[PDB]
Amino acid sequence: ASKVKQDMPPPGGYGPIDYKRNLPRRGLSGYSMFAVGIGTLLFGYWSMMKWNRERRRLQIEDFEARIALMP
């Protein structure tokens, strides 16, 4: 005496189902990354130049200590 009951889609329909590709760009420009790399290299070069000059001075100092002790 009841209505016919069956597995049916809801009245109206279903919400949209996405199927198309989604691969967003999400990236910097090439110039930006190249510039960051070059700037990092230059900063490292300057730091290493200072440190190596100081190291050469220290080496000279301890070499002179050896020279003083040699006789």
Binding site: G37, L41, G44, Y45, S47, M48, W51, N52, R55, R56
Partner: protein, 318 residues
Amino acid sequence: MFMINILSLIIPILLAVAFLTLVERKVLGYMQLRKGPNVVGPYGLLQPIADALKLFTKEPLRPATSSISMFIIAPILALSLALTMWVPLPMPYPLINMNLGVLFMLAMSSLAVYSILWSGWASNSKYALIGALRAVAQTISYEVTLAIILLSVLLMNGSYTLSTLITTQEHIWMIFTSWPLAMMWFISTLAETNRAPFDLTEGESELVSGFNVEYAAGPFAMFFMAEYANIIMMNAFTAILFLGASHDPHTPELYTINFVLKTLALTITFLWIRASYPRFRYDQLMHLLWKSFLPLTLALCMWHISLPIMTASIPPQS
């Protein structure tokens, strides 16, 4: 008292290696939306012990067609070299202080390939022979570029002594001066340790098991131990070479903690790379190393020779 130091070096490395396998299984699992070993002990902490005990209580077999002497010799050479290559590493002090530690490490690396070669040849199987020939091709691919990268980087250090690398990077990491070479160096390490995407000597999906297809139980476990030890060792060498920890002569444990953390980060990066990429074809690896890595490496070697003279920044200790 020196033997105590040798043991305190080698035993923790093996323990570390055993646990490394557990970490990789878990890291790979969580990157693959699963868990990895979490049943054998709390969080799978007993899994490496169970694996070792299973492997060393299983029957080893000698193939009927195999050459017994070389078959037995190869895993011993592999594991002994993997243990030996840790002795010059400054952490911050080395067990063996060498004037030329980098060259010693290069020579021992070159000798390590013969374990793979002789195991593949003495197995007297076709897949093992294919794996051994792939190892030959891999060495031919990476060796020269790796050596020239090392030379170019060490031009800023002033010598081949590993401990001097601590003094060179006192204020800044060497990567900030040589980040291009570093990338190439990283790739070379991936090719040096036969790790994905350059896991060609084994090549499970192509050669079943490659050079070690005929090995079972303890010798196979020794090959595995040697390979993972080499992975950890090369990542430690990279951390010392490019990410210089500050060293306090009165508090060396600070350097030890910094160095260990950097090494663990690099090893986890290796596991991540294995989880992320497909496998190269072993001719494409040679083409990559000889047509892309070698020209840039030669140009950068030229530049790094010219740079200290240009800027008057030549390091001491001729």
